[PDB]
Amino acid sequence: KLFEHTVLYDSGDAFFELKGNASMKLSPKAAIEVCNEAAKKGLWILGIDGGHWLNPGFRIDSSASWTYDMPEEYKSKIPENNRLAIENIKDDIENGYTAFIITLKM
């Protein structure tokens, strides 16, 4: 990996620069930034896994796993995919989750 598993990245840019797809641990702020960048790039968000950052260490909570399989004609649905992904992260924040891992179709 180009990034460190012992770091909770707080910038969405790190996700793309260090190739963190499906693996990099992201702060709530960074997770939202990644979702916005994904929409700008025309990328579908397949899933978001929520958990807790133990400083250091990430513990996934399976009940926070969000998943959205990509349909065949998906381009017109990217806005909805993006909207639901962000809403999901916001809800997890209300539930006390402190770290996320995002999986993009790329």
Partner: protein, 92 residues
């Protein structure tokens, strides 16, 4: 086993191979867990899940499968030596 697009996309990034998963599950159950997901976590159908789950593998190198649907619900990141196992997992 049912593997959706999300899990398929995570596999190469978390150090898992198609054979890795098949072999791990074939080795037999090593623990149990539960698959509880609110309807909002499963778009666009929004069915949600409330099912028992089985764990295969070992700490840091495991796969969780929904007992009813056969869906793989979680695969650990084998590239992260410090991965902390999901709290719902009960080994044994």
């Amino acid at each position: 086993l049912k593997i959706d697009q999300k899990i398929r996309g995570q596999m190469p990034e978390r150090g898992w191979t198609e054979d890795d998963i098949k072999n791990t599950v074939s080795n037999g159950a090593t623990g149990t867990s539960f698959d509880k997901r609110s309807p909002k976590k499963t778009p666009p159908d929004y069915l949600g899940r409330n099912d028992p789950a089985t764990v295969y593998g070992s700490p840091g190198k495991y796969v969780v499968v929904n007992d009813r649907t056969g869906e793989v619900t979680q695969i650990s990141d084998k590239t992260d030596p410090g991965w902390v196992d999901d709290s719902r997992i009960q080994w044994g």
